Amino acid sequence: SLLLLKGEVESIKKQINRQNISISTLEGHLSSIMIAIPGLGKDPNDPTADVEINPDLKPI
Amino acid sequence: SLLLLKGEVESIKKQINRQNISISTLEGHLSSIMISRGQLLKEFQLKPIGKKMSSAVGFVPDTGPASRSVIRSIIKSSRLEEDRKRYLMTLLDDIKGANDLAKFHQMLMKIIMK
Amino acid sequence: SLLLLKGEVESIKKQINRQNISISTLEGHLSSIMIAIPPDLKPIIGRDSGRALAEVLKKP
Amino acid sequence: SLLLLKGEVESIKKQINRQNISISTLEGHLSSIMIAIPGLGKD
Amino acid sequence: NQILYPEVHLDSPIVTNKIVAILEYARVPHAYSLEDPTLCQNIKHRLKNGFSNQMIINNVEVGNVIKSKLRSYPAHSHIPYPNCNQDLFNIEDKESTRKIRELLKKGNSLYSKVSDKVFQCLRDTNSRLGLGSELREDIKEKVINLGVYMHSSQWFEPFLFWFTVKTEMRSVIKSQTHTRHTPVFFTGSSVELLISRDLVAIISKESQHVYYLTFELVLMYCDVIEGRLMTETAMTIDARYTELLGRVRYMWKLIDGFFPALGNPTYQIVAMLEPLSLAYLQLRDITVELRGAFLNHCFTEIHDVLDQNGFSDEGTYHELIEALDYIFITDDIHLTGEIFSFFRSFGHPRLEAVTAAENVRKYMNQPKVIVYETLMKGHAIFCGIIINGYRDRHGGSWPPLTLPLHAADTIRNAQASGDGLTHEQCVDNWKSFAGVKFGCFMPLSLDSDLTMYLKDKALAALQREWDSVYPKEFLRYDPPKGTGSRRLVDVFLNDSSFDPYDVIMYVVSGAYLHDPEFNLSYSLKEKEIKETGRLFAKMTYKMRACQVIAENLISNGIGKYFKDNGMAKDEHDLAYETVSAFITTDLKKYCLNWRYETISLFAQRLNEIYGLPSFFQWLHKRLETSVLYVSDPHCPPDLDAHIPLYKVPNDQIFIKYPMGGIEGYCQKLWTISTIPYLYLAAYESGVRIASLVQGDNQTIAVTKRVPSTWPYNLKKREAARVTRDYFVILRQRLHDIGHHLKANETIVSSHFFVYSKGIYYDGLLVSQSLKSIARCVFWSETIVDETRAACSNIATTMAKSIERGYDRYLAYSLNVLKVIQQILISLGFTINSTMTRDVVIPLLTNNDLLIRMALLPAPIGGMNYLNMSRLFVRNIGDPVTSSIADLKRMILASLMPEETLHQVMTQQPGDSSFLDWASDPYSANLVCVQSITRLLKNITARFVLIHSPNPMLKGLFHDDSKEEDEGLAAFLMDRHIIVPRAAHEILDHSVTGARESIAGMLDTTKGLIRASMRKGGLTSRVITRLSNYDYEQFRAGMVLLTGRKRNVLIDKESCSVQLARALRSHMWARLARGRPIYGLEVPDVLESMRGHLIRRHETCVICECGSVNYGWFFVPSGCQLDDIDKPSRSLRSAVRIATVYSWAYGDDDSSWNEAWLLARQRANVSLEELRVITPISQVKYSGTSLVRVARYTTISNDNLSFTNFIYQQGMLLGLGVLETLFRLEKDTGSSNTVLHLHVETDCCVIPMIDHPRIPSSRKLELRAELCTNPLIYDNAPLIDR
């Protein structure tokens, strides 16, 4: 009877892997909303400036 | 075997604890950003097109002066015989009702198609 | 050694209980911002903090 | 004593399933959202 | 004054406030009423304090003269500008227009002396091509009596009146620039006229009506009446437009009858002329449910315009509808688009700034609601297009991007396996694109190009001196002085330290949001029919530079991915078949509907691709914190003191806090953002979409697959049904992002759409043939009145009229008549003070000299810029050979004497160097045949580009550049065999050609010429040379047509090619010194070809004579013509220099040494790499009227003995012959037609030299060092082949 718990523990792991993808979906929605609308960052530095910078620019 | 099961449960507890920090960070962001039939939009919807109203998708005779002029232009620009066109203009002068104008428009379309 | 897991499972239960409070707060915020559409019940948000909501919504 | 712990583990499985549904309905309200734009800039 | 002249044509808007300001400083009563009374209040406040200057004086005296004349007429009333058009479109006075009447009577006499010989020349040309029995009887009487038909029009006397008034006003302005005497009224039989520098007063003696006009109104009236005269003459004389004439004249009455009563709203009805015609075209649709879709909206708009103006009767509306039904209903498809030519025939409305300010303010201050899912689906399709483009140009590999954790398995496996994405996969998995982040894979190459800055655009003033544009006379206070510069190139070329990356860091660093001197202003457009008026914007230097840099970065990069799925031209010409319908709409107010939230995600993706932080969000963030205003000199703000822009009200001319876009300025970004929503509506409707933008119109082609066994009407109705379903889905999706598609304005059709060359109607072209005829106007838009440029403009407009379906012979006759009249106006009716009697009196007394100057072709020293071979084909090869052939055709038909041919061959040679020969290889070294404006622009542009301290022009321009160009030209051309064309190509692809291209893209206009004249860039010798250039070229023509030298070797009935060789040898004898000239001469098209029309049992006479070299054309019987059927640039330049040098001057080790030395200045390559990389040694009839026959004909060339130029121009001439044969026929009737076009080139042969290994006599100096500037030099060219 105690060896039957291994199927239940693996079923917990599938629920957690379903959970964090749904949280990652909520992260994708909150990232898209907060950057397309100005002023919602509450000063983390500007998210539109979160690009990488090497287009052969380097003036500074 | 049960000791091997214990280590997997320990790995679940770390992953659950990592998720609750992640939800707490999104709880801080979503509370500041976002803030129940309280209010309504004051006609910011697009007006849906009906079968009665004319649009780019098709011409339906309605209302007053413009529709009669458009129907008469359809009679003038058609390839029908001139006596038949004059008789249709006489019937159009006879027709007064809006549903009668729609029926005349459908009948005129059937004549032009054939 | 197998009976030492009693405090570990109870430690998991406090984490899910902490998660359930954070979900209930998130459900409280999204239920507050819903408006009716002339009963679709869709949420609406603004630029600074609901600045266009005085201009767009009907005066009650 | 180990059989008593199996009832608590199944209580965890039901509790995770309840949080996954409430997260799923949280995503549904957030995905159907609308943006209101003001007429004028403030300054 | 000096070299500069007052403008000839209208190029500015019409403002009410200018007229009001002139009449208030003149103290004359008037009937104008302003919507904003601020200007009159400012005038009254200035006059109360006793303010005066030199401009207020000399209008007080003019007003006193007007009042003293108006004492004589007691019952006088002033008529405003829109109400007087019917009075001023029909105005005549015999005594005021005596001189121009005598000049045009003399021109009629000169044309009547040679009209019959012109007809005989055209008749012989027609009879040579095989149409000797197809010439109509009316053509002879219309060619001979052309001037009688021109003088019989109703617009002739108004044309004389307005030409006289315009010429005297330009003379007064040119004289007063030098400076005086008081103006005096001149009394005629019907009118009394005063002409001043700024005001023209006309008093009608009978009606006692008084008209006050400015200079711009006189220019507009002259342009309108001259255009009406030309197009009425063209419609009266050509038979094809005769019934069209019977409609257009009626329109010219009807709208004029609306002008005394309606006034300025009448132009709104004129603004309905472009919709209504298309609406009447929609009455010929095969889908009978779509017949009155647009006509209902047009009639509702016309009823609303009549209702708001107080003319609300049923009878007036009904009579207007009957009149429009008479004007627009016709049976010919090809004449439906001719009303398009008559849009500008009624003038232009008067404008105010406050109305356009309200029109902008209504749309730029509107709240919107946007749903999130539609925006995210469009973003997903946008990302899918970028991914598919990068896979297409990098061999199926995905761009560098990181998908989020919540991405679907399909997108993850597509990234892992390098597989593409369809639109369905992007729409169904849009949440997988929510948190993506691109990498940097697009370079920023801004040092390689200079073309973006040298385009001339005006700059706004600084913010702190924003009142500097308004004069002191119209303000209640004293405005601050303006210290900023006014032009883009003036700031750019004087910039001692310029770096494009610093211009990028102006936005990236965020200093653009906080700089104090940023400003933006609006200005009214010049010539439009919209009563409110349209605006164009000007801003300061740095933000404009950032805007052009951003547009070029979008253009050269990501925009090429989106150009592939769409089509730039002609919609790619639109079992199962594909059936399509079309949706056309206008995009006038779509820029005002754009917001930050809609464009933000696309701008973030472009920021991640281009690696620029917060770059593409610049427009909305700058405009939401800045105050806009409309700037006109006569429309002042209602301010009693100077205040900054953040304190003005949100009223009058100001727009305080806009949220929206400017017209232009983000055009490619908005297009690339637009296409995903079209694809989303396509996926939701299940159709295929092609898109095309043209002018202000958007055209969407909806395509569906259909069974091929179905009848045509069922296929077309199914296409219309899925098209209207797509329209409903697209309207809902565009309202989801807030753009208001406006179904009332949109045309949905199954046959036609509007593009650049006309209207496409199911494979047919409906063109505006009479639009270019209205531009056949005396003089051209040049700073100096030049006769040769005017004659070239006349020839160009007549040729463009021929390409759209007008008759060739009548256009040639109109060209001859207009050249004769232009020469007589240039000699006798001009403001040029350099016209002395020594050339005026010998030309005006000698009639035959003027006729021979008008008929002689321009490549051989005459004034006729229209060749006869140009009447049939676009491309004539050798202008000299064609001119000699044309002259021999004139001698054969007794139009010109034989001795003139001798006078061509014994002509005095000009003085030009090897560089001038290499720049113009087909020139015959004539005397004073250049243009004043082109030479002045070249000298001014060269002076400024030498004296520019800009670091990008580091070493291209220097004082010894011209000596280097002359040395290179003498190295290329001074050989034992002279090849001008190869030297032209090598000089064009070299550093000299790059310098000439850079000087050519710099448009100086009038302002840079005035700046260089004040700074001393132009010396006095150049000014005195170019001020007398027209006089000297008239003297050169007079000397050419007088000299008595004759040679017995010259003879008619000889080859035109050999005569061209003799002329080129004689006129270039100083530089050539008897050495041969090779590669310039080709056979003439009309000389070498003879045509014949053959039935079934008829035999060809030319084939019986023994000629077997011909092309064969076939036209079947019973076809309805009207009805529907059923590396770097510098590396490429270096390779071009190497291959032209090796092909022309031989292939040897010394030849490749010289080729490598020439090509090393463009790219850093070795001799071996250059030797490896260089190579070693269905006619296009669309877009013209030629299509109308060419869809049925069949062309075979089996009997053509194969030289290539003859092979294409023969097929083009055959299509022209078949077009001319079936011009006035609805149907090819009952018999097949065979056209034989025989080529006779037993003459016209040249001794071929092939590659005779031509060596170099001179020494190649090159330069002491190579210019390593990235504009012209490629340091790392790599290898591609």
Ligand SMILES: Cn1nc(C(F)(F)F)cc1C(=O)Nc1ccc(S(=O)(=O)N2CCCC[C@H]2CCN2CCOCC2)cc1
């Ligand atoms: C969101 N959406 N949906 C649709 C559709 F209905 F088609 F589906 C269309 C759009 C949309 O906004 N289109 C759009 C795209 C671009 C521009 S534009 O303003 O830059 N440009 C084109 C139109 C006319 C003005 C012209 C400026 C040209 N200047 C500069 C060059 O010299 C001459 C003047 C305006 C509108």
